[PDB]
Symmetry: D2
């Protein structure tokens, strides 16, 4: 197919490279002329701007650092919209604000253009080997049309379930992993301060929610089944957090996420949940967010 | 064997019950006379106080709510120490402050008595079926001697690798799981606010550090190998957290752990780590705790 | 003077109203037709868009909700720049991102136009009576030129000392007051949970840094003089926070700012500051922010 | 008067010294022999233990680091209670847990002894000059009886309004001042990172709640009068916090208290308070603590 590829960064370059290997004709653009030259050496045609990249393209892929740059490439001076056919499909593979993705898709549809969000999981090493995780937003029809192109860049495609759902699931995933890293560090540094070999902690945690997560362990048969009868009471969880923070403060291990988490359990106790299962923290956060209680 | 069991609460009662089933002779004590009566009906001998429970016992188990109650049962009026043989082994299976465990073990050794820490993972349902996770502190010799008794109450034993290491690994495990629950709730409620079905997010997160944890995914070949060359740069992780918090604040989903986590990544960027792998957050927290940089 | 006023919200409407009262000729624009009509009834000339508002104006005031809207009104379709004289002075009185203010001022200077930041302190009640606090950014020349106009809308002018310094001081002020409100609430609710009448706590706190602030009490003769010898050691402050959080957690009073503050003191103790004066927390935060130690 | 003084630390030594200057006869005790020697040189009589210090004393003052040490000095081996007259008055000037103060006062009353809590504000420099703030707990009768003694050590007495109210107001004061210091540092460092001279910020803040506090400015005529009609809406305050956090994160100034504060305003918005006065944050925190809404 005729493809325009805008954004030849650490992810974009290997993604574009895999499309060339699968026999697509690429017109490429990036602000960095050396990055363009590298794709031209692999068989891409250079374009002077996004509009020229888009001219006669069936698929327009953007892979850019943020939503302001995506908007500028699509709607700015010499933007994709100046070169775009109404039969073409724009695929934004960028990680940007989901409400910016919604507004770009709406603004494209107002001009008779089709756009879908397919951000990716895994890092540039996986981009090189075409083993990215494709988080495919867009309509079922758009995902079906894009899939042959997308499978050149990734090895696994997840149906995110609609326009803007790809960037939403990417954002939930990255929010959880990035925050989890800071909490993981607190546990590991407290472990070191207590002179406990980390491998012993990892062995224990690999067998509990500590290492496996709550989503598929503690939650399914309790809060997610509407059952808050306790396996492990909020009062006990709150007590154990207080012990961890007592130790951390005696050993000068700063634990901001632990300190914040205890005040969440304290709010749950103030709301009368002390004898509920620890999975009831999900319902407490829903109520704090103004949502209707499910249990 | 001849066993004393002190503490017949939601965990202790079924633990004591399993020891009776395996043919041990138990002398039991608790402040609740009905809890004692229930074990006496199953063939336990009652004790008037901990000293009487301990008399002629080879193994003395405590399962109590906190370190002050363990100290009072061991060292107080009619305490275990008044009835204890120097050949006997005290096993505290309580979840208490680890520096309190160390001081109890030291105070016992000063009187020529042997004591180890074997707190347990999993909840009272597992206590009933003898499927607790045994977190065995103590010397190699103590863990070897206690193992046949402990396997009556649990189905898996982890050798924590020394006196006080059992209570340490229990505290690290519970700190991590209890705080993780609060973070998991933030991610799940943001997911709901963005109209993304939870199961779709869990399917994606099950394949990344979000669902699998950093301990065995992102950390081993980076920070834990002394390599902070980036797979995923701190600058990008910090930017994505900012987007998550922007969305949460627009949708009034309070995310205190996320908000705290972004200020940790901000401090990492201030310390010059913006171009390092996200696993460098472990080193940042070590430095914040006054530890010497490893990388 | 000939003034354009863009933004007739809860602050903008009474500010524009005070300029009319002091005899200025105003050309007004807002997207809300009722807000424009209210100013027209007081003697303003309506303009169809920002460009037309700016035409023949000596001073162009913007009072808008955020920096994206200020940029759109200045640089967008029918924007101020299409009607602006190089002799005119643009005054943004909005509370927006300070780095956006810097970029707007620079973008205006690149087109030969003059722009200054004069955000305002105090509320719409003060906007009605012309008793706002004027937080005047801009060059000394711009502040001098604007002052006669600004004194129609405010009763007190602070010269913030340069382009972008007005929005900076407004942001520092509001950051501190808005966050302080959340901490004040934690202290007041813990007070109630301990069955202590609030008036007793306020009487005590009015005599200490609790009620008077650290900026002019504990800091000047210690950290701000480069003296970290202790009047009140970080170790003691950290211990007392632990007691407060123990009580709050027993009484189920959630104290997230207190919980966060103890982990800041914990980091100071990790950095070897436990025997330093509590004012050394400022130096700890500077180091955490990557600044050169004092 | 005949006074026993137990605790000759950085605060206790100068407090005892001022009682000597005002012509009282002191029996002093501390485990630190250098501190005792210094007071003996100023005319104090040394005592071997608290019981001997208390013998024939009308007033017994304790100034100790924590509630366990106060309990040990009053009720332990050779404790004050062994030397105490029922006509004497015990004054604990320590900063300890208020529920420990309550239990000490109750335990003393059970033995027919009278005890009040009079902790102090201001630092050791003020202790030297007798210019401490006296935070007088106790009954009206106890405060009246103690006042002549207390005015030797402090220049201002506040009647806290009952037994245990002195330690409560000391804890509220120190909680607020100690946490405020950390918030003050965030504002001052953000100021420096923006290249704004700090003196300009202090001049502005001295005229607003930023420098004067909310307790006597924004609160009295709004939330404390049951009026949540907005002078400054929660929505606007929340927006401005988001701008401050955006700037802090771009300039890598870590602002954990600011980050936490924005999630409190976010919870207020979730509870429907966005168009309420910012003083409604007090009501939000009361509701989060399980208290009945007032307004």
């Amino acid at each position: 197919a005729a493809i325009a590829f805008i954004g030849l960064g650490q992810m974009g370059s290997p993604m574009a490279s895999n499309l060339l290997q699968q026999g697509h004709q690429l017109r490429v653009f990036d602000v960095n002329a050396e990055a363009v030259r590298h794709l031209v050496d692999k068989g891409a045609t250079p374009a002077a701007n996004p509009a020229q990249a888009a001219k006669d393209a069936e698929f327009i892929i953007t892979m850019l650092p943020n939503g302001d740059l995506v908007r500028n490439v699509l709607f700015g001076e010499n933007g994709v919209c100046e070169g775009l056919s109404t039969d073409a499909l724009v695929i934004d593979m960028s990680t940007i604000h989901p409400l910016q993705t919604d507004k770009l898709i709406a603004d494209m549809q107002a001009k008779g253009f089709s756009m879908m969000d397919v951000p990716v999981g895994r890092t540039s090493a996986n981009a090189i080997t075409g083993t990215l995780l494709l988080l495919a937003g867009g309509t079922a029809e758009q995902v079906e049309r894009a899939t042959p192109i997308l499978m050149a860049m990734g090895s696994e495609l997840i149906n995110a379930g609609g326009p803007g759902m790809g960037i939403r699931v990417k954002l939930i995933n990255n929010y959880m992993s990035i925050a989890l890293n800071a909490l993981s560090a607190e546990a590991a540094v407290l472990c070191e301060a207590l002179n406990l070999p980390f491998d012993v902690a990892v062995k224990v945690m690999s067998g509990t929610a500590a290492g496996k997560g709550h989503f598929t362990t503690s939650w399914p048969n309790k809060v997610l089944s509407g059952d808050l009868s306790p396996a492990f009471m909020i009062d006990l969880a709150h007590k154990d957090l207080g012990i961890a923070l007592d130790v951390a403060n005696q050993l000068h291990v700063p634990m901001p996420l632990g300190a914040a988490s205890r005040e969440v359990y304290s709010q749950a106790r103030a709301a009368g949940r002390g004898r509920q299962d620890w999975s009831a923290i999900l319902e407490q956060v829903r109520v704090s967010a103004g949502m209707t209680a499910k249990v």
